[PDB]
Amino acid sequence: MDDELLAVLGYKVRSSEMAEVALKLEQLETMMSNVQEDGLSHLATDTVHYNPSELYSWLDNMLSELNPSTRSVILVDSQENGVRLVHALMACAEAIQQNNLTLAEALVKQIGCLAVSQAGAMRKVATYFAEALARRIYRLSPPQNQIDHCLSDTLQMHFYETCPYLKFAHFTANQAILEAFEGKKRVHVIDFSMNQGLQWPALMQALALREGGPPTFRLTGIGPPAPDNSDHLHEVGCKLAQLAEAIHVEFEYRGFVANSLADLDASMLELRPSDTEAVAVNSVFELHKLLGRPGGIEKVLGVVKQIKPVIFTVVEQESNHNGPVFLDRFTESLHYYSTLFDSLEGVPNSQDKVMSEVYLGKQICNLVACEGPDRVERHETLSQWGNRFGSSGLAPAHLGSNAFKQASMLLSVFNSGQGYRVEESNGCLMLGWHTRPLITTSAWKLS
Amino acid sequence: IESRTVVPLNTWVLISNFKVAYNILRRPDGTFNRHLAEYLDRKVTANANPVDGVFSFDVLIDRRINLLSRVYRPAYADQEQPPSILDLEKPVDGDIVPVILFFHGGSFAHSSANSAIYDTLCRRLVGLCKCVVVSVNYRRAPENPYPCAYDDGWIALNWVNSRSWLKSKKDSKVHIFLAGDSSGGNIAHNVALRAGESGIDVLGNILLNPMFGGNERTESEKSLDGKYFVTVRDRDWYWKAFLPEGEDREHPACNPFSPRGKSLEGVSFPKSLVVVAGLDLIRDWQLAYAEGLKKAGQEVKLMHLEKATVGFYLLPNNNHFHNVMDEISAFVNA
Numbered sequence: 133m134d135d136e137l138l139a140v141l142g143y144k145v146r147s148s149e150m151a152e153v154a155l156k157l158e159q160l161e162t163m164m165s166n167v168q169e170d171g172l173s174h175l176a177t178d179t180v181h182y183n184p185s186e187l188y189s190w191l192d193n194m195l196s197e198l199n200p201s202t203r204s205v206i207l208v209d210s211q212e213n214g215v216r217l218v219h220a221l222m223a224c225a226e227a228i229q230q231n232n233l234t235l236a237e238a239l240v241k242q243i244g245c246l247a248v249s250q251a252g253a254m255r256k257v258a259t260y261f262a263e264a265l266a267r268r269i270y271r272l273s274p275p276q277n278q279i280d281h282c283l284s285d286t287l288q289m290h291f292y293e294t295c296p297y298l299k300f301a302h303f304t305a306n307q308a309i310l311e312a313f314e315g316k317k318r319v320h321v322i323d324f325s326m327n328q329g330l331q332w333p334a335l336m337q338a339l340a341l342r343e344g345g346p347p348t349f350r351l352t353g354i355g356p357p358a359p360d361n362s363d364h365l366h367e368v369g370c371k372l373a374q375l376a377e378a379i380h381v382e383f384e385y386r387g388f389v390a391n392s393l394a395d396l397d398a399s400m401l402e403l404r405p406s407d408t409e410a411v412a413v414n415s416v417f418e419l420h421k422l423l424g425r426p427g428g429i430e431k432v433l434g435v436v437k438q439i440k441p442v443i444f445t446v447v448e449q450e451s452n453h454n455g456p457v458f459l460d461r462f463t464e465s466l467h468y469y470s471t472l473f474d475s476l477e478g479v480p481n482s483q484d485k486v487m488s489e490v491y492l493g494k495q496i497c498n499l500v501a502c503e504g505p506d507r508v509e510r511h512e513t514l515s516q517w518g519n520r521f522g523s524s525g526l527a528p529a530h531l532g533s534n535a536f537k538q539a540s541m542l543l544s545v546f547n548s549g550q551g552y553r554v555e556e557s558n559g560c561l562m563l564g565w566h567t568r569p570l571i572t573t574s575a576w577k578l579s
Numbered sequence: 580i581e582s583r584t585v586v587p588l589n590t591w592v593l594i595s596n597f598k599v600a601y602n603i604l605r606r607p608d609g610t611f612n613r614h615l616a617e618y619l620d621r622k623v624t625a626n627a628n629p630v631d632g633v634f635s636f637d638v639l640i641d642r643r644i645n646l647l648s649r650v651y652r653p654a655y656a657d658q659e660q661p662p663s664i665l666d667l668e669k670p671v672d673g674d675i676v677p678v679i680l681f682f683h684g685g686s687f688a689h690s691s692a693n694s695a696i697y698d699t700l701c702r703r704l705v706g707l708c709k710c711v712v713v714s715v716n717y718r719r720a721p722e723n724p725y726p727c728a729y730d731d732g733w734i735a736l737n738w739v740n741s742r743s744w745l746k747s748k749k750d751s752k753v754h755i756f757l758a759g760d761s762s763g764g765n766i767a768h769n770v771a772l773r774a775g776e777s778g779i780d781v782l783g784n785i786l787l788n789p790m791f792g793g794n795e796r797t798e799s800e801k802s803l804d805g806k807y808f809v810t811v812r813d814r815d816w817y818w819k820a821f822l823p824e825g826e827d828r829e830h831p832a833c834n835p836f837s838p839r840g841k842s843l844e845g846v847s848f849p850k851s852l853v854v855v856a857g858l859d860l861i862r863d864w865q866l867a868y869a870e871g872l873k874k875a876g877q878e879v880k881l882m883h884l885e886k887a888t889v890g891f892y893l894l895p896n897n898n899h900f901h902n903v904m905d906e907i908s909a910f911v912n913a
């Protein structure tokens with residue numbers, strides 16, 4: 133097993149390989165004094181590093197290349213009236229948990245009163261949470277209480293414009309996909325969250341100017357049934373095919389309609405033999421929705437294992453919201469959403485900002501009021517997702533520093549490169565407000 | 580070969596890895612590989628659930644400069660469920676409660692307040708000295724040169740002083756201790772020097788291998804040149820990257836006892852505790868600093884460890900660690 137002291141410092145080195153690592157460091161130091169300011173620069177700029185925590189493998193790469201729970205909380209120092217608001221919110225939630233309905237409506241009215249005199253992000257968070265608790269309180273005995281929906285079409289694109297969460301996710305997924313599409317003749321891409329298809333044009337454009345020629349590109353899209361009863365996937369395919377005629381590469385499209393992902397099968401996708409065409413699976417904010425169904429995520433993971441792809445990109449939200457106790461989930465969501473609402477304060481006022489705020493409010497309302505299979509906002513953390521994936525036959529695909537650099541460069545254009553910071557953990561990436569990780573991106577592969 | 584006989588194997592591995600990495604991130608022109616440095620840095624996150632009697636959380640004390648701070652406090656004795664946010668700033672209890680304001684090292688370039696090496700050092704300080712620890716995330720160089728770091732330290736000191744739940748129930752005042760290591764010693768010295776004329780009262784200073792220097796070469800530099808994980812060519816790189824362009828190493832930020840500095844005689848300076856490593860490169864400069872403090876009339880205790888190197892306080896597997904921790908605990912709770 134690993135030695136304890138380095139394990140707590142942040143370096144995974146086994147106790148029986150201490151002498152080997154020391155000798156490797158001594159060898160690396162020797163040939164760094166003979167090499168001039170050229171070699172060192174060649175290691176600084178050209179070569180790419182993988183898994184810096186594993187000292188043994190990192191040192192091997194350098195040597196061979198040179199000589200060929202935990203709940204984080206952030207307190208913004210701008211609150212001077214919100215203490216009463218948080219007391220009222222917690223009291224209302226506790227009263228709900230103990231069947232104290234009349235007290236709950238009393239506190240809801242009190243919350244409505246106090247939030248009027250406040251300002252900033254806390255007022256919006258309080259308003260949305262008060263509405264969520266009122267909707268919760270509207271579910272006693274009357275069996276005629278409807279809900280809302282998720283218009284992920286006109287709102288998610290507005291969120292894309294407002295916020296860097298989708299751009300960062302798309303960029304990292306595209307960087308990971310391209311690295312695994314080197315040397316292959318024909319490629320195939322399966323998307324579990326086709327939506328509007330605003331991440332594929334960039335990937336195709338980057339793939340066309342490659343050293344060797346643009347490979348054949350085939351794309352299969354899966355989406356929920358349309359709200360207005362139209363053929364949106366056909367239109368998306370038409371635009372993508374039109375954009376693929378200026379890259380000197382073939383293009384194919386396919387549309388799929390399914391209420392969930394648990395009813396899909398590997399036979400419906402019409403997969404060509406793997407030896408002649410690679411397959412890539414992509415998912416952006418679409419895996420946590422199957423946590424409510426009992427046995428849907430295991431079915432989807434089994435289908436993915438049967439597909440046998442070369443890479444599997446997953447982007448999710450980094451927070452624990454699947455706790456059985458209502459109070460703990462309420463507190464966690466309260467803090468996470470408070471931090472997400474405080475990060476959109478410096479953005480200039482625009483219609484896109486309002487639309488993203490409405491999207492977040494709908495998320496809060498669905499996460500709090502609804503219970504059972506109707507609840508789709510079941511977020512988890514990196515450890516939980518890794519435990520879920522590890523019992524299926526998937527291995528972690530450690531991302532490269534080059535992606536770190538590109539993500540940081542693309543993140544410096546937003547708010548003059550302030551607030552948002554990238555980090556790394558077990559071969560994964562994280563986009564967060566200062567020291568609070570909000571969304572993680574990871575890639576997996578067959579074991 | 581000589582370094583392997585004065586330190587344990589795992590400390591040697593850690594320090595050698597740090598030196599090799601910082602070798603490959605340094606460029607002769609003067610620029611720094613910031614993106615690669617952040618990729619290679621190992622960090623942790625705040626955790627409000629008490630682990631081994633300590634919990635922590637982050638505070639954003641200034642937004643115009645993105646100034647962060649991590650606060651560590653001991654676990655509550657009268658609270659079964661994990662703490663939340665209303666109880667985070669809960670008024671402390673006891674007659675006297677120390678507050679340690681900590682600045683991390685790294686020659687104004689490496690590491691950060693959220694790094695695991697300093698999160699562990701601060702947790703051990705809380706566990707042993709039994710007090711409150713506030714870690715500061717100051718601006719690094721060469722992106723932000725002199726004096727961004729002293730300004731960040733001053734703002735953090737004002738924020739710590741102005742709090743009301745950090746006070747004491749004996750004299751309605753806060754007990755503030757300044758601490759640091761490597762560049763943290765320099766920051767603490769300058770923050771105390773600027774705090775002596777503002778009115779804020781500081782109880783003491785804790786300097787763990789402070790990073791000072793001058794213009795003339797000492798015998799320690801000639802003899803220990805690059806033989807104990809510290810060379811002279813990289814000391815000049817760090818001093819050039821931090822000090823303003825066109826200034827030598829006789830600037831007051833480098834040599835406190837320089838002809839261009841103000842005398843410490845007749846000036847309100849707190850009691851100090853200087854820890855000096857015998858086997859480090861810049862040993863004579865630290866001893867000269869302690870001698871100057873003694874001569875100026877200020878109180879100062881010198882702890883010279885004859886066989887200690889840099890980074891002897893990052894692992895508990897040596898004998899200097901316990902001695903230094905006991906001395907710090909007796910220094911604070913006196």
Ligand SMILES: C=C1C[C@]23C[C@@]1(O)CC[C@H]2[C@@]12C=C[C@H](O)[C@@](C)(C(=O)O1)[C@H]2[C@@H]3C(=O)O
Binds near residue numbers: 594762790891
């Ligand atoms: C280039 C450097 C800078 C070191 C010394 C070293 O020679 C090797 C690595 C640095 C360092 C790493 C962590 C600690 O903060 C420090 C004081 C140390 O012992 O070693 C750090 C120390 C420093 O920042 O002064």
